[PDB]
C-alpha cells in the first residue's frame, strides 16, 4: 500500500543483515521498482585455490566458503569426493550427516528470521509504546501459552530496551529505517514488543541449537567430523551424547513452535500485501534427508525433502533434475569473456574485474541457468516441489498456513511466501528430529560402523548434491593424477542472487525486485524485505 512517487535510482550498499557483501541497484518509476541489479562485491578464489590439491583436503577449504551455512559445504564436498572415489558411505554416516544438516536448518532459519529479517517488519522503538499487560493478552491469544510471553516478561524486555535507548548509544539500531516512524511498518506496538522479546530469546536459543549440532559435528561454527567414506565421530553414535542431542534439539523445537511460527504467522497477517510482491516462476531442488545417499541419483530420488524443477509456476508438472542441464554463464559477471555456458564439470574461474556499476559486468557471482532459465532455489522451491508431490508433512503445514492466513497458495509465489516457507520447513525438520535420532541411536548401538574403506583413483569425477538452508548446492570434481584438476561449486545464493545470464535474463532476486513499492526512497525497507526473504549469502555465492 504505502508508495512514493519517486522516480530515479536507489542503491543500497551495503545490504546489511545478510551474509557477505552485496550492492543492490534499482531504477524506480513512481515509487515502484522497474529494473534491478544484484552486484556481489567480494571475490576470494576457493575454486582456484583448490586446483592441484589433495581431494581429501577439499571439504576443509570449501567449508570456508561460508561460516553461516557451516558444514553444508564440507558435506557437499564429502559427497562429491565419495562420488569421484566411488565409496558408499555406511548407514550411520548417512544418518549422522543428515542429522547435522537438520541441526543446521534449525539454527540457520531461527537466526535468519529474528536477527536478519525481522528488523524489516518490526519497529523495535514502537515496542517502547506498547503496554505489557495488553501485549501479554495478545500473546496469550495468538501464541502457545508461555511463561516467556507474560506481562512481567514483556515488561522487563521493554524496560531493558527503554534504558538502552535512553542511553543514547543505540548501537545496531543506529539509523534504523524505523526510527521516527516509517509508513512501511504496520505492526501494532504490542506485536513489536512480543517480537522483540523473542528476538532476544532467539539469541540464546541459537546458542543452544549450535550446541546440539556440535555434539555430532565436533563443533560449531565449522564442523570437524566428516571424512571421505563417512564420518569419524564414533561417540556421536552413543547413548549419552545422543540423549543430550535429543534434549537440546527438543528445546530448540519448543521455541520454533511457541515463538518462531506464531510470530511468522503474526507478521504475515498484518502484511498480507506482501503475498503479492516479489514472486518468481521457476524452482529447483536437489532434495535433502535422503534414505539412500549412495549416489546423486539415489539422493535425488530418495530425499524425504524431494527433488524437482517447477517451471512457469506449473505445480502440476514437477520435472526431474537433469544434472547435465545445469550450467553457468559469466557475461554480466566479473570474469573473462568466452566462459558463458559452462557445465560445472567444465567450469572456468577467470576473474576479470571492470568497474563499479558497469551494467555489462556487475557481479563476482556467475549466473547459473538450468535449461536456459533462472531458477529460484531454497525453502519456497522445496515447499512447492514437496507439496506438489504430496509430501504429507508439507501438505499439513502448508495448508495450516494457507488456512490461518486465508490466502490461496498461488500467494506463496512472493516475498511473503518465501519467508513463510522457511518457517514451514523449520516446523517440519523439528517434526522429524525424534524419529531420525532414534534410528541412529538404535543403529549405532547395534553396530557402530561410521567410515567405509575406499581408494584414490588416478582419474575420476564426481558431484556432491545437497539442499542446504538456502537451496540447491552442488560440488563438482575432476580428479586427475590423484589430485584436483577442477573443483567447482554452484551454490544456492548463486542461483538466486547471481546477475543476468548471457540472454540478458534477470536472476530470481533481480526479477523479484521489479514491482517493489518504495514508500520512502530515503529509507527503502521494501528493497531489503525482498532481498532478505531470499536469505542472501554472498560468500557462499561467490566463493
Amino acid at each position: 500500500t504505502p508508495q512514493s512517487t519517486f522516480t530515479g535510482p536507489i542503491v543500497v550498499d551495503p545490504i546489511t543483515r545478510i551474509e557477505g557483501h552485496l550492492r543492490i541497484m534499482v531504477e524506480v518509476e513512481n515509487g515502484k521498482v522497474k529494473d534491478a541489479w544484484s552486484s556481489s562485491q567480494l571475490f576470494r578464489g576457493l575454486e582456484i585455490i583448490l586446483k592441484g590439491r589433495d581431494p581429501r583436503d577439499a571439504q576443509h577449504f570449501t567449508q570456508r566458503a561460508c561460516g553461516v551455512c557451516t558444514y553444508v559445504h564440507a558435506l557437499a564436498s564429502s559427497r562429491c569426493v565419495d562420488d569421484a572415489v566411488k565409496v558408499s558411505i555406511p548407514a550411520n554416516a548417512r544418518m549422522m550427516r543428515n542429522l547435522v544438516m537438520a541441526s543446521q536448518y534449525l539454527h540457520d532459519h531461527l537466526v535468519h528470521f529474528y536477527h536478519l529479517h525481522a528488523l524489516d517488519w518490526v519497529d523495535v522503538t514502537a515496542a517502547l509504546k506498547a503496554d505489557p499487560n495488553k501485549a501479554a493478552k495478545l500473546a496469550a491469544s495468538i501464541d502457545t501459552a508461555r511463561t516467556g510471553n507474560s506481562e512481567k516478561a514483556l515488561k522487563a524486555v521493554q524496560d531493558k530496551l527503554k534504558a538502552f535507548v535512553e542511553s543514547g548509544q543505540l548501537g545496531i539500531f543506529t539509523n534504523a529505517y524505523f526510527l521516527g516512524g516509517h509508513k512501511a511498518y504496520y505492526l501494532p506496538p504490542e506485536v513489536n514488543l512480543i517480537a522483540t522479546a523473542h528476538y532476544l530469546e532467539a539469541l540464546h536459543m541459537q546458542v543452544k541449537a549450535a550446541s546440539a549440532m556440535a555434539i555430532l559435528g565436533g563443533k560449531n561454527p565449522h564442523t570437524q567430523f566428516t571424512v571421505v567414506g563417512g564420518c569419524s565421530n564414533y561417540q556421536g553414535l552413543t547413548k549419552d551424547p545422543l540423549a543430550n542431542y535429543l534434549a537440546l534439539s527438543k528445546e530448540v523445537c519448543q521455541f520454533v513452535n511457541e515463538c518462531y511460527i506464531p510470530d511468522l504467522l503474526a507478521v504475515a497477517g498484518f502484511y498480507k500485501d506482501w503475498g503479492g510482491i516479489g514472486g518468481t516462476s521457476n524452482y529447483l531442488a536437489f532434495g535433502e534427508f535422503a534414505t539412500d545417499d549412495s549416489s546423486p541419483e539415489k539422493h535425488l530420488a530418495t530425499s524425504q525433502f524431494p527433488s524437482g524443477v517447477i517451471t512457469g509456476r506449473d505445480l502440476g508438472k514437477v520435472d526431474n533434475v537433469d544434472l547435465g542441464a545445469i550450467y553457468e554463464d559469466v557475461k554480466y559477471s566479473w570474469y573473462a569473456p568466452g566462459g558463458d555456458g559452462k557445465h560445472p564439470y567444465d567450469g572456468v574461474t577467470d576473474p576479470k574485474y571492470t568497474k563499479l556499476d558497469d551494467k555489462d559486468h556487475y557481479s563476482w557471482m556467475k549466473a547459473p541457468r538450468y535449461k536456459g532459465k533462472a531458477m529460484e532455489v531454497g525453502p519456497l522451491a522445496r515447499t512447492f516441489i514437496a507439496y506438489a508431490k504430496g509430501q504429507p508433512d508439507f501438505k499439513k503445514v502448508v495448508d495450516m498456513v494457507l488456512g490461518k492466513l486465508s490466502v490461496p497458495a498461488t500467494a506463496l509465489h512472493s516475498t511473503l511466501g518465501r519467508t513463510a516457507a522457511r518457517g514451514i520447513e523449520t516446523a517440519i525438520v523439528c517434526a522429524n528430529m525424534e524419529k531420525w535420532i532414534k534410528e541412529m541411536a538404535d543403529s549405532g548401538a547395534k553396530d557402530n560402523t561410521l567410515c567405509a574403506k575406499w581408494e584414490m583413483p588416478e582419474e575420476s569425477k564426481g558431484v556432491g548434491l545437497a539442499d542446504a538452508p538456502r537451496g540447491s548446492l552442488s560440488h563438482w570434481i575432476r580428479i586427475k593424477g590423484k589430485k584436483i584438476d577442477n573443483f567447482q561449486l554452484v551454490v544456492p545464493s548463486t542461483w538466486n542472487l547471481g546477475p543476468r545470464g548471457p540472454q540478458g535474463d534477470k536472476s530470481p532476486v533481480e526479477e523479484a525486485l521489479i514491482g517493489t513499492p518504495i514508500a520512502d526512497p530515503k529509507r527503502p525497507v521494501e528493497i531489503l524485505r525482498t532481498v532478505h526473504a531470499f536469505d542472501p549469502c554472498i560468500a557462499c555465492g561467490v566463493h
Binding site: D13, P14, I15, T16, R17, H21, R23, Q41, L42, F43, R44, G45, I48, I49, D54, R56, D57, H60, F61, R64, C66, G67, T70, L116, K160, F164, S167, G168, Q169, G171, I172, T174, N175, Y177, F178, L200, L203, H204, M213, A214, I215, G218, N220, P221, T223, Q224, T226, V227, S232, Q235, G236, N244, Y353, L356, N448, T449, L450, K453, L528, A539
Partner: protein, 261 residues
C-alpha cells in the same frame, strides 16, 4: 561513552567469526551488547542499510570519545583493493581509515590476523593480514573460527585491564599459550605409540591417537581441548584430527590435512 564503542569491520571473510562471537556465553551476546560495549557498526546484524549504514559507521569513527576496531577477514589487495568493496570503497581503504584513530585493534579469526584462506596459494586476490596490510601490531585471536571464549575474553580484557600478554604472533598468551596436543586427552596413546591407521579401523573406534591421520594438535597453539566448543565438543573428540587452524598460513603450512608432511 557510557559504554565503550566497538566498530566491527568485515573484509574478505566467511562470517564464521561473527557467528562464533554470538556462540559466546559468559556473557551472552545481548548482554555484552546492551550492558558492556556499544557495538556501533556490525553489518551482519545492524538495522540500517545502504547510506544509513555508512552514516552509522561515520558517526562511530567520529565519536566524541574513541572506539575499538574489530577486524574480520583479510584484505583483498589486488587491483587497488577493488576485488573487495563496501559502500563503493575498497576494504583496505576503509580498515586504513578505521585503524587510524582506533583505541585498539582486535583481529578476530585466522583470516584477519594472518591473511586467511583467501591468501592460500595461489592467492588470486592477493589478500593479506590486517597487520601485513596496515603495518601495525594487532591483537590476534586466530582460529577458523576462534573460540568465543577467547574473543569475548580478549575484547573485555582489552577494555578492562588493557592490552593482554601477547606471544610472537600476537595471540593473547592466556589462550594461545599451550599446545592443543599437550592438553589432548589422547596424549597417552600418542606416547604409547598407539595410532589410528584409518577412520574405519578398530584403533579409530577405540580412540587411538590421530597423529598418523595427520593431527596437527602437536604443532598447534590453542585451548580447544581444555575449553571445548559450545560447551560440548572439539575436533579430536569427534574422532577427527586437528587442522592446525589457529596457526598462521595454516592453509599451506598444514595442507595435506591427513598426512604428517
Amino acid at each position: 561513552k557510557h559504554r565503550p564503542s566497538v566498530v566491527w569491520l568485515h573484509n574478505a571473510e566467511c562470517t564464521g567469526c561473527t557467528e562464533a562471537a554470538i556462540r559466546t556465553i559468559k556473557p551472552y551476546i545481548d548482554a555484552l551488547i546492551l550492558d558492556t560495549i556499544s557495538l556501533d557498526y556490525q553489518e551482519t546484524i545492524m538495522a540500517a542499510a545502504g547510506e544509513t549504514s555508512e552514516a552509522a559507521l561515520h558517526e562511530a569513527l567520529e565519536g566524541k570519545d574513541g572506539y575499538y576496531l574489530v577486524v574480520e577477514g583479510g584484505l583483498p589487495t589486488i587491483d587497488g583493493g577493488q576485488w573487495g568493496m563496501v559502500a563503493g570503497h575498497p576494504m583496505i581503504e576503509t580498515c586504513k581509515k578505521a585503524a587510524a584513530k582506533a583505541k585498539g585493534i582486535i583481529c578476530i579469526g585466522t583470516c584477519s590476523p594472518y591473511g586467511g584462506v583467501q591468501k592460500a596459494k595461489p592467492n588470486p586476490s592477493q589478500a593479506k593480514g590486517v597487520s601485513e596490510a596496515l603495518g601495525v601490531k594487532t591483537i590476534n585471536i586466530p582460529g577458523c573460527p576462534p573460540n568465543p571464549i577467547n574473543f569475548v575474553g580478549a575484547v573485555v580484557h582489552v577494555l578492562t585491564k588493557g592490552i593482554p600478554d601477547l606471544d610472537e604472533n600476537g595471540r593473547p598468551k592466556l589462550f594461545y599459550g599451550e599446545l592443543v596436543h599437550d592438553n589432548c586427552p589422547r596424549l597417552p596413546h600418542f606416547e604409547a605409540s598407539e595410532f589410528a591407521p584409518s577412520f574405519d579401523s578398530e584403533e579409530a573406534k577405540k580412540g587411538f591417537c590421530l597423529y598418523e591421520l595427520g593431527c596437527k594438535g602437536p604443532v598447534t597453539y590453542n585451548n580447544c581441548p581444555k575449553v571445548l566448543f559450545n560447551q560440548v565438543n572439539w575436533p579430536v573428540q569427534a574422532g577427527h584430527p586437528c587442522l592446525g587452524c589457529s596457526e598462521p598460513d595454516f592453509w599451506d603450512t598444514m595442507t595435506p590435512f591427513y598426512e604428517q608432511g
